[PDB]
Amino acid sequence: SMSVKKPKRDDSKDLALCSMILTEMETHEDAWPFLLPVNLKLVPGYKKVIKKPMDFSTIREKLSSGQYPNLETFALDVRLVFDNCETFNEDDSDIGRAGHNMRKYFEKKWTDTFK
């Protein structure tokens, strides 16, 4: 409350550390469905169904230009990528499997870097 704060957790390295995580997600062999925005002209249904499209290149641009206020808003966009994937793709598909694998990979790096 006013003039009453918990001890200040050091967030000075968060930007660099999210960048590192995103580099590792970019370079994963199963990243290919997530590297670029889904082409809304060429994929029937996507535009209407997926209200908030997100991909790794869009996160990278947001990160590089100070559009993440804190590390939680960064995690929310990464999770959005996988939530969108699960919304549009069957689990038993190459893309559906890729999304599950990448979400696991991310959540471990997230816990190990910050928790």
Sketch the domain layout of the chain as residue ranges: 1-115
Q: Are 22 and 56 in contact (CB under 8 A)?
A: yes
Resolution limit, Å: 1.8
Radius of gyration of the chain, Cα coordinates, nearest whole angstrom: 16
User: What span, in angstroms and rounded, lies between the C-alpha atoms of 51 and 104?
Assistant: 24
- CATH of segment(s) 1-115: 1.20.920.10
Question: Are 14 and 73 contacting, i.e. CB atoms less than 8 angstroms apart?
Answer: no
> Which alpha helices (DSSP H) does the chain contain, by range?
14-27, 46-49, 56-64, 71-88, 94-114
In the block, residue with structure tokens 């060429």: 42
> Are residues 87 and 50 in contact, defined by beta-carbon separation less than 8 angstroms?
yes
User: Residue 62 in contact with residue 77, Cβ under 8 Å?
Assistant: yes
Give residue 114's identity as a one-letter amino acid code.
Answer: F
